Amino acid sequence: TRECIYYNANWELERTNQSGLERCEGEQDKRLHCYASWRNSSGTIELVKKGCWLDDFNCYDRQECVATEENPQVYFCCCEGNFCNERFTHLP
Amino acid sequence: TRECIYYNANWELERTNQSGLERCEGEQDKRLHCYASWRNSSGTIELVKKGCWLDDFNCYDRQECVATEENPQVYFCCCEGNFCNERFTHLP
Amino acid sequence: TACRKHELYVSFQDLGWQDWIIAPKGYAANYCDGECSFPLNAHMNATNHAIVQTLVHLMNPEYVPKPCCAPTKLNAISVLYFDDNSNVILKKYRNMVVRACGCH
Amino acid sequence: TACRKHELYVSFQDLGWQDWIIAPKGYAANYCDGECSFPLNAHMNATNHAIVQTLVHLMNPEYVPKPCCAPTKLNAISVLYFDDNSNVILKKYRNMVVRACGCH
Amino acid sequence: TLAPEDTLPFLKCYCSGHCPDDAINNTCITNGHCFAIIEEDDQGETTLASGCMKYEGSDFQCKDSPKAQLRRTIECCRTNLCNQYLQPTLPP
Amino acid sequence: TLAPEDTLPFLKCYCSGHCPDDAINNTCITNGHCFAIIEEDDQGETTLASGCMKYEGSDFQCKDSPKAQLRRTIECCRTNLCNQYLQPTLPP
Ligand SMILES: *[C@@H]1O[C@H](CO)[C@@H](O[C@@H]2O[C@H](CO)[C@@H](O[C@@H]3O[C@H](CO)[C@@H](O)[C@H](O)[C@@H]3O)[C@H](O)[C@H]2NC(C)=O)[C@H](O)[C@H]1NC(C)=O
Ligand SMILES: *[C@@H]1O[C@H](CO)[C@@H](O[C@@H]2O[C@H](CO)[C@@H](O[C@@H]3O[C@H](CO)[C@@H](O)[C@H](O)[C@@H]3O)[C@H](O)[C@H]2NC(C)=O)[C@H](O)[C@H]1NC(C)=O
Ligand SMILES: *[C@@H]1O[C@H](CO)[C@@H](O[C@@H]2O[C@H](CO)[C@@H](O[C@@H]3O[C@H](CO)[C@@H](O)[C@H](O)[C@@H]3O)[C@H](O)[C@H]2NC(C)=O)[C@H](O)[C@H]1NC(C)=O
Ligand SMILES: *[C@@H]1O[C@H](CO)[C@@H](O[C@@H]2O[C@H](CO)[C@@H](O[C@@H]3O[C@H](CO)[C@@H](O)[C@H](O)[C@@H]3O)[C@H](O)[C@H]2NC(C)=O)[C@H](O)[C@H]1NC(C)=O
Ligand SMILES: *[C@@H]1O[C@H](CO)[C@@H](O[C@@H]2O[C@H](CO)[C@@H](O)[C@H](O)[C@H]2NC(C)=O)[C@H](O)[C@H]1NC(C)=O
Ligand SMILES: *[C@@H]1O[C@H](CO)[C@@H](O[C@@H]2O[C@H](CO)[C@@H](O)[C@H](O)[C@H]2NC(C)=O)[C@H](O)[C@H]1NC(C)=O
Ligand SMILES: *[C@@H]1O[C@H](CO)[C@@H](O)[C@H](O)[C@H]1NC(C)=O
Ligand SMILES: *[C@@H]1O[C@H](CO)[C@@H](O)[C@H](O)[C@H]1NC(C)=O
């Protein structure tokens, strides 16, 4: 019953939506999270994909989208809640 | 898509039909047979159960209901076809 | 050796059920046997988790065992058996014979 | 020893996929292990054919082997992986983690 | 309305051998039968076991041992905690 | 319309090792990919194999061997009978 902010830079590739509000759909008795993944390079921020995510251990009871990876190619953060795909940070 | 003659002596026990025409229902790519089982004792014939039967090796391409068992408690014969539950015999 | 549906005919006469089974007096209950090894082909029907497990088995052959050759499709058989009060009862026993196999 | 869903966390870092898997960097793919012996209880989820096979194994312990402790319920996991042209792609890989187990 | 092989768990069985992760005070919530097996493994030491069946396939697992290498006796009672006060003895 | 993991079998793969019961003139009708594995078992004798994948899980089975005890190389081509004229060689 979750809801995230769906964003996709490859909308023209697969004939999909570049943004919008995505209502989450998942299995029963299972939690549903939101995810945000972007590209950071020398102070420039370029979001690639935001949306829904199935049950995952890495984002249990997190109210914000904080990426803990130390300098990966694409930053990723998982958050449990409603509309937690609004903002993001790279605090490791 | 088969059809057999459904007969049951215990109709009052399970609130079912004592006779009738039963349309067979089985899995796809599988054959469906009819079966007839009765009680024979010193020349007396008393049918107990006639109806449908799933895929079975014992009644491949048999156009009649012939019981091959040598003097069992309840005679049984399996036949492949449509309305092959009409008659039966005890030729071993 | 590979994941393969073998043939096995089990007779109720030698299974002690000849007293309460009118018919059939024995059916073909094909048993599933073989081994599942990398790679898992098209005919060796496999799941994503089976592939992941058989890939983990590559690095750690002792911690995690290989997937198992287990049935994937089953069919029911009709059985006309006696009751406790010598009553004839027909029942379609589900999941009795094996139609296919695969790595689980 | 019994049919029991064990716990196993497999990390893509040691599986050589760290170059094309953005996240997750490792998921809990519980593996299924144990032994299936007569009788098969309520929690050891079993089929009619598994019971028939484990009953035939009683008389002939050499001809027919015992049923196998294999998964019965599986769940999908979301994976955000790279493509061949360095394109980020999300996919829900089905049948990845084990939720239950039983004798097959 | 609903099949007896997928029947809602109501029966209560007792627990000495086969004993699940969530049985409380050695009590299994089952839907089939209650069973008590007195198999003694090969070595003279004798064993005991009392647990809950899954109903599917119990027709096969509730008759006496037809022709098995060891000797076993399994009583299938459908009364709550009937396997409690049960001490079988293998017949020669 | 239909998922790519349950895609209709169309591709044609060749057959030297893993070879099904109904492949005609060593030809498998598949829906995933065509693969050719040159694993040599422990003993100096070397082996060869060419067959058809099931597409599900091929993403894992189509990269090079990450860290395995023996050495293997698997080329996943989607062209009809591409694994035919393929002779891989394990790199040191
Ligand atoms: C994209 O990458 C840039 C560059 O790495 C990130 O800027 C970084 O922002 C963090 C915010 O916590 C800065 O860390 C903090 O900075 C100051 C001292 O400079 C102080 O508040 C703390 O001690 C802490 O170190 C970090 O310095 C800064 N990096 C640079 C090179 O200036 C940015 O956050 C990234 N954005 C996203 C959306 O990932
Ligand atoms: C119910 O049981 C009775 C009694 O066993 C069956 O009667 C039997 O009918 C068969 C028909 O083939 C007879 O066999 C044939 O009989 C004559 C010689 O008597 C001859 O045509 C053949 O050489 C062959 O032997 C059999 O003799 C007869 N039994 C008796 C005791 O008279 C009857 O068929 C059974 N009915 C059903 C529906 O099962
Ligand atoms: C994986 O699942 C598939 C699909 O159920 C199994 O494929 C099946 O394989 C059998 C054995 O070859 C096929 O039966 C044969 O088919 C043809 C019919 O013209 C003929 O060669 C034989 O008379 C025989 O009946 C069966 O058709 C085939 N099923 C399908 C849908 O193609 C496969 O066996 C499973 N894997 C394992 C390891 O069991
Ligand atoms: C046979 O299938 C059943 C049904 O899927 C499996 O039963 C499941 O067993 C697990 C492990 O005990 C249960 O999880 C536990 O449940 C309660 C929740 O209050 C608690 O004790 C623990 O926190 C844990 O989550 C699970 O609920 C249960 N499923 C059902 C529907 O009752 C069983 O494990 C399978 N057999 C084998 C051998 O795996
Ligand atoms: C996906 O895209 C469609 C089509 O663009 C969205 O429907 C509306 O499209 C118009 C333009 O035609 C936008 O201005 C609107 O914002 C879109 N939304 C609404 C509510 O009118 C559609 O909503 C998008 N999302 C989904 C889930 O289909
Ligand atoms: C099962 O029994 C019902 C009810 O008896 C059958 O319906 C008809 O019932 C009347 C008596 O009420 C009989 O005289 C008729 O012969 C029955 N059939 C028809 C076609 O009218 C019903 O047909 C039986 N069979 C099934 C499959 O439901
Ligand atoms: C279980 O047993 C404990 C002590 O062993 C007792 O206090 C309690 O009544 C029992 N509870 C349940 C839920 O059976
Ligand atoms: C298979 O090969 C035979 C000879 O091996 C040949 O005559 C025939 O063309 C081929 N048939 C098919 C269906 O591939």
Residue numbers in the entry:
A (entry chain F), B (entry chain A): 26 to 117
C (entry chain E), D (entry chain B): 410 to 513
E (entry chain D), F (entry chain C): 50 to 141
From the paper:
ALK2 is a type I receptor that binds two different ligand classes of the BMP/TGF-β superfamily: the BMPs and the Activins. With BMP ligands, ALK2 signals to play roles in bone modeling, while with activins, ALK2 regulates signaling by forming nonsignaling complexes. To explore, at the molecular level, how ALK2 interacts with its cognate ligands, we utilized cryoelectron microscopy (cryoEM) to resolve the ternary complex structures of ALK2:ActRIIB:BMP6 and ALK3:ActRIIB:BMP6. The overall complex assembly of ligand:receptors is consistent with previous BMP complex structures, with the type II receptor binding at the convex, “knuckle” of the β-ribbons and the type I receptor binding at the interface built from the concave fold of the fingers and the wrist helix.
We used a similar experimental setup to resolve the structure of ALK3-ActRIIB bound to BMP6 to 3.3Å with residues, ALK3 (50 to 141), ActRIIB (26 to 117), and BMP6 mature domain (410 to 513), being well-resolved. During interaction with ALK3, BMP6 buries a total of ~1,325.4 Å2, similar to that of ALK3:BMP2 (25), while only burying 1,113.8 Å2 while engaging ALK2. Conversely, ALK3 caps the wrist helix with residue Gln117, engaging Asn469 of the posthelical loop of BMP6, whereas ALK2 does not. This interaction is facilitated by a three amino acid extension in the β4β5 loop of ALK3, not present in ALK2. Given the lack of direct binding between the carbohydrate moiety of BMP6 and ALK2, it remains curious why ALK2 is reliant on the presence of the carbohydrates for BMP6 binding, whereas ALK3 is not. Comparison between the CryoEM structure of ALK2:BMP6 and ALK3:BMP6 reveals the presence of a salt bridge between ALK3 residue Asp69 and BMP6 residue Arg413, which sterically occludes the previously mentioned His452 driven hydrophobic contacts in BMP6. We hypothesized that ALK3 utilizes this salt bridge to stabilize the prehelix loop without relying on the carbohydrate moiety. Conversely, deglycosylation of BMP6 does not reduce binding to ALK3-ActRIIB-Fc to the same degree (KD of 30.0 pM and 35.1 pM for BMP6 and dgBMP6, respectively). In contrast, BMP2 binding was similar between ALK3 and ALK3.D69G, where only introduction of the β1β2 from ALK2 reduces binding significantly. These data support that the salt bridge between ALK3 Asp69 and BMP6 Arg413 stabilizes binding and constitutes an alternative strategy to stabilize the prehelix loop in the absence of glycosylation. With ALK2, BMP6 utilizes a glycosylation on Asn454 to form interchain contacts that stabilize the prehelix in the active conformation, whereas with ALK3, BMP6 utilizes a salt bridge to stabilize the same interface.
